[PDB]
């Protein structure tokens, strides 16, 4: 039922779409691999960030300074993952058009 | 752990195969990512187990989200090996 | 849907900021990454090498951030020591080191083949 939340669907379908698009693109193996891997990683990192968010909320509702930092650090990881994804697709698909 | 031998075996084959530098890096990197995600998933589990042995909807949710990450990483590894080996023997 | 990006983006900055400000080891790691990203960008290589150079050091930062979050969770739960507390950080620290060794090896292989 974690899969059914209206956020993962949006994240997932975005990642899933790119994998499909990369699967159809006329690129060589190394490019196709890198295209898929970057989007997959984002999904991987987000899943890990959500898992951390679960552990924090598991402890309780009472806000602690460290509780917020873990979430921010986890969000930062996703941000970096998404940037790496955009840079990857840019560098590889640039001048491909 | 079994994975260390498994990772080695993956590295053995990667070095065994006659592939260029870029392809050889991609193969081993994909395998290493699985270890990293598994290690990170294992870390998350260790935390959850410590807080309480008792069941909580949030405790099981983290473990599920963590195991899915491992799955996706493994899927990514298979796709990588499939694609590159297909191209290599193409 | 548009707002979900903004909220998420704001957290990420707090994460990078807190990580930066609190540790010298992080800032120096951050600098090492940024220099690596820069060097790869101007380097005369093909796109696949450039991406591999960038991706690998990015991954170091990703795992570093993720492990840092796990550490924050452990420290949150209590001052108290624990075998499962040490285990969590031990596992998370291993992941960080693997990502770096890969990064070092990958960066070493690519510059070998390019300059040798
Ligand atoms: C449980 C088994 C799942 C993994 C093996 C079977 C399905 C995946 C096959 C390889 C990945 C498919 C995506 C790559 C693709 O579509 O382009 C094919 C092309 O790159 C071959 O050179
Ligand atoms: C010309 C270059 C094209 C660049 C393509 C950009 C998209 C490629 C990879 C990024 C995948 C992002 C999917 C994950 C995602 O954004 O969802 C998480 C986010 O909504 C959290 O707020
Ligand atoms: C508003 C809809 C947006 C859709 C997402 C963006 C679409 C991205 C690419 C569309 C073209 C697909 C690639 C087709 C192609 O390159 O052909 C591959 C080659 O095998 C042809 O022989
Ligand atoms: C994907 C859209 C998000 C915003 C776009 C901004 C992208 C930022 C950096 C991506 C670098 C793009 C240039 C890559 C490139 O191929 O350099 C040109 C070179 O190949 C000329 O042969
Ligand atoms: C041609 C033969 C080489 C094939 C290499 C394919 C690489 C696929 C996965 C790499 C990850 C290795 C670790 C596997 C693992 O952790 O599973 C262990 C667990 O499922 C046992 O219950
Ligand atoms: C030259 C500038 C860098 C080139 C790539 C630019 C990156 C483009 C878009 C990335 C920002 C998307 C924001 C998504 C986000 O907030 O991350 C979600 C995370 O923090 C929590 O899940
Ligand atoms: C393509 C993007 C490169 C990302 C590589 C990893 C970045 C790691 C650290 C950079 C985070 C920037 C935050 C800087 C910061 O917090 O300074 C604010 C504070 O010091 C004001 O005194
Ligand atoms: C303070 C944080 C700064 C973050 C900046 C984000 C980095 C954006 C793009 C990284 C550089 C990649 C572009 C490399 C490129 O296009 O050159 C390739 C070209 O020389 C091939 O002929």
Residue numbers in the entry:
A (entry chain B): 24 to 120
B (entry chain C): 32 to 121
C (entry chain A): 6 to 121
Q: Anything the authors wrote about it?
A:
Here, a method for presenting crystals of soluble and membrane proteins growing in the lipid cubic or sponge phase for in situ diffraction data collection at cryogenic temperatures is introduced. The method is a variant on the recently introduced in meso in situ serial crystallography (IMISX) method that enables crystallo­graphic measurements at cryogenic temperatures where crystal lifetimes are enormously enhanced whilst reducing protein consumption dramatically. The new approach has been used to generate high-resolution crystal structures of a G-protein-coupled receptor, α-helical and β-barrel transporters and an enzyme as model integral membrane proteins. Insulin and lysozyme were used as test soluble proteins.
DgkA is a kinase that resides in the inner membrane of E. coli. It is responsible for the ATP-dependent synthesis of phosphatidic acid from diacylglycerol. Crystals of this protein grow optimally in 7.8 MAG at 277 K. DgkA is therefore an example of a protein that produces crystals at a temperature other than ambient, where in situ data collection, as implemented in the IMISX method, cannot be performed conveniently at most synchrotron MX beamlines. Increasingly, we find that membrane-protein targets crystallize optimally by the in meso method at 277 K. The IMISXcryo method is ideal for such targets because the crystals can be grown at 277 K and then snap-cooled and stored in liquid nitrogen for shipping in Dewars to a synchrotron for data collection at 100 K. Complete data from the 12 crystals came from a total of 280° of data gathered at 20–40° per crystal. The highest resolution shell had a completeness of 98.6%, a CC1/2 value of 0.36 and an 〈I/σ(I)〉 of 1.00. The data-quality and refinement statistics are similar, as are the two structures, which have an r.m.s.d. value of 0.238 Å over 585 residues. These results show that the IMISXcryo method works with crystals that grow at temperatures other than ambient.
